[PDB]
């Protein structure tokens, strides 16, 4: 899966 | 009368579901699942995830009497995990930790239900659900 930008870092 | 006895069983179920949810939500590892994803910070969350779910929403649904079986509740736990795996990438360890916690939240919930819920009581819950569907 893993389709999103992410919860951490600069762009969330 | 039949309905009132059903209603006692369902109340016992909700008490149990609240207890399970409290144990999941007070476990530090699952803090990220204890509240809805902040869709303002995680600006692409609703583009990716079609049905958000979290433990505070599960608590709401228990109090709304949306769950008549433990499996109905577990479907929403499973959704929390499924959402986390659909959304979070699997490259950096900060992302992996969220995916690990999601799978561990799911396994813990299923393990507590399997360990603690009386199977006869569960079956009675399923009958109450089926009865209400068909009446």
Structural class of chain A: little secondary structure
Shape of chain B: elongated
Number of helices of chain A: 0
End-to-end gap of chain A: 17 Å
SS element count, helices of chain B: 6
Percent helix of chain B, as a range, is over 70%
User: Strand content of the residues of chain A, in percent?
Assistant: under 5%
Radius of gyration of chain B: 16 Å
Helix content of chain A: under 10%
| β-strand number of chain B | 0
Radius of gyration of chain A: 7 Å
Number of strands of chain A: 0
Q: Of all protein chain pairs, which has the greatest interface, and how many residues does each chain bring to it? A: A-B, 10 and 22 residues
What's the number of structural domains of chain B? 1
**Quaternary assembly:** heterodimer
Family (chain B): Belongs to the AAA ATPase family.
Protein name (chain B): ATPase family AAA domain-containing protein 2B
Coiled coil (chain B): 3-24
Subunit structure (chain B): Binds acetylated lysine residues in histone H1.4, H2A, H2B, H3 and H4 (in vitro).
Plain-language structure description:
The PDB classes it as nuclear protein. Keywords: bromodomains, chromatin reader domain. It forms a dimeric assembly. ATAD2B bromodomain in complex with histone H4 acetylated at lysine 12. The complex is a heterodimer of chains A (12) and B (135). With 12 residues, chain A is mostly loops. Helices cover 0% and strands 0% of the residues of chain A. Chain A has no helix or strand. The N and C termini of chain A lie far apart (17 Å). Chain B has one domain (1-135). In chain B, 70% of the residues lie in helices and 0% in strands. The longest helix of chain B has 24 residues, at 2-25. Classes of the chains: A little secondary structure (12), B mainly alpha (135). At the A-B interface, loops of A face helix 2, helix 4 and helix 5 of B.
């Amino acid at each position: 899966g893993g389709k999103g930008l992410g919860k951490g870092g600069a762009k969330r | 009368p039949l309905e009132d006895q059903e209603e006692n069983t369902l109340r016992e179920l909700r008490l149990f579901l609240r207890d399970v949810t409290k144990r999941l939500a007070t476990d530090k590892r699952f803090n990220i699942f204890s509240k809805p994803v902040d869709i303002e910070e995680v600006s692409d969350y609703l583009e990716v995830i079609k049905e958000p779910m979290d433990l505070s929403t599960v608590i709401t649904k228990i109090d709304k009497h949306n769950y008549l079986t433990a499996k109905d509740f577990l479907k929403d736990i499973d959704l929390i995990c499924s959402n986390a795996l659909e959304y979070n990438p699997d490259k950096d360890p900060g992302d992996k930790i969220i995916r690990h916690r999601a799978c561990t939240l799911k396994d813990t919930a299923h393990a507590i239900i399997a360990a603690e819920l009386d199977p006869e009581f569960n079956k009675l819950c399923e009958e109450i659900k089926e009865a209400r569907i068909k009446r």
